[PDB]
Amino acid sequence: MPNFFIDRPIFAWVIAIIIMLAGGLAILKLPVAQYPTIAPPAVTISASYPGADAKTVQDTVTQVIEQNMNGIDNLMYMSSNSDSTGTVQITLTFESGTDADIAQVQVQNKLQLAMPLLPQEVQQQGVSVEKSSSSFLMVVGVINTDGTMTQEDISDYVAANMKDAISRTSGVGDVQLFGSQYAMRIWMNPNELNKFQLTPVDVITAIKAQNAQVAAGQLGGTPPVKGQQLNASIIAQTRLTSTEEFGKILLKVNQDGSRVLLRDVAKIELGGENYDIIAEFNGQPASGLGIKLATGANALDTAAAIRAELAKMEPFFPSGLKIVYPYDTTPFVKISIHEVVKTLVEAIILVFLVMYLFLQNFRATLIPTIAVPVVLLGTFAVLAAFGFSINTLTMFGMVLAIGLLVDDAIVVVENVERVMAEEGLPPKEATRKSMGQIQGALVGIAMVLSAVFVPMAFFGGSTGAIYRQFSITIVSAMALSVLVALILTPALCATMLKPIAKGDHGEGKKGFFGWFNRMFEKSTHHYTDSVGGILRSTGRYLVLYLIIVVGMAYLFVRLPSSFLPDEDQGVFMTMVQLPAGATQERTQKVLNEVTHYYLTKEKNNVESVFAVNGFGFAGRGQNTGIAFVSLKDWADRPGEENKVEAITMRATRAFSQIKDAMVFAFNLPAIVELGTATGFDFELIDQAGLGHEKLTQARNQLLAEAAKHPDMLTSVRPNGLEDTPQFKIDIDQEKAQALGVSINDINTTLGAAWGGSYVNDFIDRGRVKKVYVMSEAKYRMLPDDIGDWYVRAADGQMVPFSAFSSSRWEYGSPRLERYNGLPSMEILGQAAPGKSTGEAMELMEQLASKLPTGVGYDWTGMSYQERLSGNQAPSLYAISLIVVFLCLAALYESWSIPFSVMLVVPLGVIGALLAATFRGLTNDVYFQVGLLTTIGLSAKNAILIVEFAKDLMDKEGKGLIEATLDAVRMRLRPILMTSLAFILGVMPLVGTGVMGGMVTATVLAIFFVPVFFVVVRRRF
Amino acid sequence: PGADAKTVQDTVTQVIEQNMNGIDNLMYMSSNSDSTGTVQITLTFESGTDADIAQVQVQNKLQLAMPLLPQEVQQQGVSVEKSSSSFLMVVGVINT
């Protein structure tokens, strides 16, 4: 085939132009984001029940919906929370590979049929269903600095004038408002209600009657009295639009014609739907939007358009209203794309320098400059053809792929110039010569390298999704580089290289290159002499080979092993937890001192503190909170002591002296869709209707046994909230019936005054908003306020709650978890230092076996995933080596010669093993794929050397040691050229020994490869 | 039920429209709100788009506004189906 395109250089140009046009169109059409979708599809059902405790939520909503989640396909597990905020969430997690559209429609369709089974208040509130496994592109914060707008005002403005514009923006997929818009709040007064013999039932009845829309009909509608001239709609009532009109709602006409209006027994003002969250941004009132990138979109274009539209809106923007961007993922996208172009142009500069230093002509330095960008552009086409996006994983894969594409380029040009200098052939006849020498090895290298990278793409779940990005990027760039090296570079050498006289090695030219040429020739003969000597004492170097492979196994096992470490992202969280019964004000004081710490003692690192009151990591409530701390870029806080790893520990130790609170700073994960991957996620399950307290006791027994094993388990804790005092109030049914009081009036008065009640909607400047009734705060704080509410009896007399109720304190759970339909408790932990998380998990299974009867367990989250990927590892690694061996045996026509190459490649890997040792790197997926790339690259060196060795023995009938020496002589310059390009490339990143490790990664190959070729063919 | 076109728009059409964002292959969106109290929101998709997946995605995005819609409407039923705009034929029936 290369013969074909050398006689047809313009056909090959046509093919390279097609590849460039496809790659350009691919870059224009290609989606771009930080990470691809790795998390398995998760659909979350959310509902609200105002005034409700955790078990009313569970006993009327959660269990009912969970019982109707049948018939849905491809479900892995379902978990759900019911807390004392009236909030329930049910997350159904599906198998990786299942259509998230079909998954969500099936879930909501079952929920729809279950809706008539829910309480009438829950149906009124409405039930939402979202895809929860997608994460935010950025978070636009909207804060007020002049101290004139409350958070309710900011969020109302953002919904009215910002949100829908942001959603209509191109690329935006979903926008979530971090707050509630205005709501017509009715703050009743029990003393005024009692003064007029009124209850909240009357207030609600009047509101439903006077703030209603009423559909009459038509004036002169069909069927008419024919003769009729006019047809017109009849409109009776419509909604209200003002607080003033709500104040004039007539509740009662006194019998002397006097009016009792709603304003006379309640305060009326625009407020929030919800008052349990308090969001601040550096101590200022705050709100914002969480924006999600749409499907097939460009995060760079979308973020620009978002800041563009936010940039515009100033002709409408109120006083003190500022936009801030506490969280944004597109900087990391831009960094990973920039490092691809930085590596590409630095690659062509260095290969230009090295090609010229060895070959002393400019026309040879053009063939790599053309060939490399062609295949880099083709990779984008192949990525687009298969549905992949430009992300940090594929861009990492392209950066690693560049090193192999330049070696493919250098090998082909160098061998044709060696054939011209050794044999004195014209460029055309000599290029036929040279690819006839290397074409089979080139194809075999393609098979070998996909045998390395392809099999790891077949992990399941999250692990496979990450490996797929590297695999297709590297295998694509490798396969097209081979196709280009058999099509494009043959024609370019045959068409562009000058002839060379036989024997002209440039020893006779002058200046610097004359000195270099015979310096290199002298070293070339030194090298062949030394390898010739090594081939007499091969037992000695076989022993040295094993001395160094146990040395590599040692420093490899010693490295920290973490699949996806939580690197410094520029944002971290700090969790806040106060005791049972703690009020919102007490939480705010703690958060106030938390931001005061961050903005003073970490002045030079912290840029923003986004404090959230009422919402915790492990569970919501008045005694929970979390602060999102965003830091300045990596430049303006140099040194490792100013990274998140040390800031969090300084923050945690400083926060240990906080009285009456439990504060903890920690790093958010690299892939927030997954959450850590550090440790395990554990589910304790009531399998036999045991009850809450029994399950709590078992969890305590499990936690105690875990703490007794610090050599294996670290920080084993529940991911939930502990039981708290609650106010139990009993209605005497007999006393109620004897006084003529209905139970519905009693419960409606209690739940409306104290819990609040959603009545109906109204229209505020053309936007539909809700109407809530509730008591004033001062009349619904403490138990003695219960006796200030009166209820009307059938005889008209007003009775107070004290006459027919009794109260006591008891304990109950503010948060009830469920797993797969049964009551559960989520436990978190990680393995002790040095130990694997697999051992920690099997210790937990042991300790769980002796829990009380009727208590099961299960693994959820990414512990489910690691169980999956761990059972796949050995077969995948086994198939990789099996097919590698098979293709090499196909290349060399030998069941034995593959062992020569397979046994030498773990030597190039240790040029990076010590670099991780001196810098302090971690063994992760990024380091592992990098190890494979080095293994493949060094595997290309030995494959060519052994190919030339065998060809010389088979074609020319040369001796074994003669052919081996001739082979390593013909291959020394290209190996040192490629390695020289690499060492000069990483030198600007510089600790001298890291470069000195790469050099012996090369010197080990050039000596040991001939050793293994001779040792293997002797023994077989 | 019977509401004027202004109420229907402010309490149903706008709510459904504000959540019809970011859907695959959506070209444009038209809607009318009638004196009868009825809404039709027609979402039009790029040619070649699978219509059944399109209907699926519309129902999934409609769920985000399903809670916010009024009392009467959420229970009375919200149809979401593929649609045509033209008549293929008119079959007529007379009595002779």
Ligand SMILES: CC(=O)O[C@H]1C[C@@]2(C)[C@@H](C[C@@H](O)[C@H]3[C@@]4(C)CC[C@@H](O)[C@@H](C)[C@@H]4CC[C@@]32C)/C1=C(\CCC=C(C)C)C(=O)O
């Ligand atoms: C000057 C230079 O070094 O390269 C510049 C030039 C640059 C390579 C740009 C990255 C990206 O726009 C590039 C694209 C793919 C964008 C438009 C496409 O049609 C390509 C034909 C075009 C090639 C050049 C260009 C315009 C650069 C960047 C990166 C800035 C953008 C990101 C996402 C990191 C850079 O400044 O490094």
Ligand SMILES: CC(=O)O[C@H]1C[C@@]2(C)[C@@H](C[C@@H](O)[C@H]3[C@@]4(C)CC[C@@H](O)[C@@H](C)[C@@H]4CC[C@@]32C)/C1=C(\CCC=C(C)C)C(=O)O
């Ligand atoms: C010209 C050339 O080929 O060097 C390129 C190629 C380069 C040496 C890269 C630095 C680094 O990734 C390199 C390592 C050592 C990283 C992982 C290792 O296991 C090696 C298998 C790998 C070899 C090639 C690679 C990918 C280069 C750089 C440095 C810029 C890269 C980053 C991430 C800032 C360059 O020159 O710009």
Ligand SMILES: CC(=O)O[C@H]1C[C@@]2(C)[C@@H](C[C@@H](O)[C@H]3[C@@]4(C)CC[C@@H](O)[C@@H](C)[C@@H]4CC[C@@]32C)/C1=C(\CCC=C(C)C)C(=O)O
């Ligand atoms: C994790 C992984 O990738 O397996 C790697 C790791 C791998 C099993 C290697 C095949 C072979 O050398 C392996 C042996 C047993 C080779 C003999 C000894 O020296 C061992 C100390 C060495 C340990 C692992 C190693 C180095 C791999 C291959 C096949 C590589 C073959 C070619 C031609 C590149 C692979 O990439 O699949």
Ligand SMILES: CCCCCCCCCCCCO[C@@H]1O[C@H](CO)[C@@H](O[C@H]2O[C@H](CO)[C@@H](O)[C@H](O)[C@H]2O)[C@H](O)[C@H]1O
């Ligand atoms: C579904 C099947 C997938 C199998 C993949 C397995 C990988 C196989 C890699 C094989 C790569 C090419 O394999 C190789 O092709 C070249 C083509 O000149 C042959 O070449 C052989 O004959 C020609 C002339 O007749 C000589 O110039 C050449 O030096 C000699 O080795 C080799 O005999 C063969 O081993």
Ligand SMILES: CCCCCCCCCCCCO[C@@H]1O[C@H](CO)[C@@H](O[C@H]2O[C@H](CO)[C@@H](O)[C@H](O)[C@H]2O)[C@H](O)[C@H]1O
């Ligand atoms: C030329 C380029 C190279 C071509 C490379 C082709 C790669 C082909 C990859 C096939 C992927 C399937 O790999 C398949 O994984 C499953 C796990 O789910 C393995 O099954 C394994 O895991 C199960 C759990 O499921 C374990 O209980 C058990 O130890 C084992 O049987 C199968 O034995 C294996 O066949």
Ligand SMILES: CCCCCCCCCCCCCCCCCC
């Ligand atoms: C061989 C080089 C390959 C480079 C690939 C770059 C891919 C980027 C494609 C999207 C470009 C988006 C531009 C963002 C504009 C920001 C305006 C401030």
Ligand SMILES: CCCCCCCCCC
């Ligand atoms: C023997 C001639 C082969 C020609 C192949 C042309 C198509 C190459 C596409 C990559």
